[PDB]
């Protein structure tokens, strides 16, 4: 998945 | 950045963990999506997309 801030 | 609203909760990014729906390409907060930081799915489809 394209995530941010993980 | 910080104030950008995309999630269905209508609240901003605000530095929070987010995940992009693979079907509608909307950024959703992990908390809103009921996803743990330690167990992110490899493909994510958001609740709105799942409801047709
Ligand atoms: Zn949200
Ligand atoms: Zn979606």
Author numbering:
A (entry chain B): 1 to 6
B (entry chain A): 229 to 280
Sentences reproduced from the published study:
PHF13, also known as Survival time associated PHD finger in Ovarian Cancer 1 (SPOC1), is a chromatin affiliated protein that is conserved from zebra fish to humans. PHF13 has been shown to modulate various processes including development, DNA damage, cell cycle, antiviral host cell response and higher order chromatin structure, underlining its biological importance. PHF13 contains a single C-terminal PHD domain, which we demonstrate biochemically and structurally, is a molecular reader of H3K4me2/3. Similar to other PHD domains, the PHD domain of PHF13 folds into a canonical Cys4-His-Cys3 (or C4HC3) motif, that coordinates two zinc ions with a well-conserved globular domain.
To gain structural insight into this specific recognition of histone H3K4me3 by the PHD domain of PHF13, we determined the crystal structures of both the apo-PHF13 PHD domain (aa 226–280) and the PHF13 PHD-H3K4me3 peptide complex. In the complex structure of PHF13 PHD-H3K4me3, we can see that the histone H3K4me3 peptide is bound against the central double-strand anti-parallel β-sheet of the PHF13 PHD domain and completes a three-stranded β-sheet. The first four residues of the H3K4me3 peptide are embedded in an exposed binding groove on the surface of the PHF13 PHD domain. Similar to other methyl lysine binding proteins, the trimethyl lysine 4 (K4me3) is bound in an aromatic cage formed by residues F241, M246 and W255 of PHF13. In addition, the K4me3 residue also forms two main chain hydrogen bonds with M246. The first residue alanine (Ala1) of the H3K4me3 peptide is anchored in a small and secluded pocket created by I247, V268, P269, E270 and F272, and the backbone amine group of Ala1 forms a hydrogen bond with the backbone carbonyl oxygen of P269 and E270 in PHF13. The limited length between the aromatic cage and the Ala1 binding pocket and the restricted nature of the Ala1 binding pocket determines that the PHF13 PHD domain selectively recognizes only methylated histone H3K4. The Arg2 residue in the H3K4me3 peptide is bound by two backbone hydrogen bonds with E248. The surface charge representation shows that Arg2 sits in a shallow negatively charged pocket, reminiscent of the Arg2 binding in the ING2 and BPTF2 PHD domain-H3K4me3 complex structures, but in contrast to the RAG2-H3K4me3 complex structure, in which Arg2 is bound in a relatively hydrophobic pocket. Our binding results show that the binding of PHF13’s PHD domain to H3K4me3 was diminished by the simultaneous asymmetric dimethylation of Arg2 (H3R2me2aK4me3).
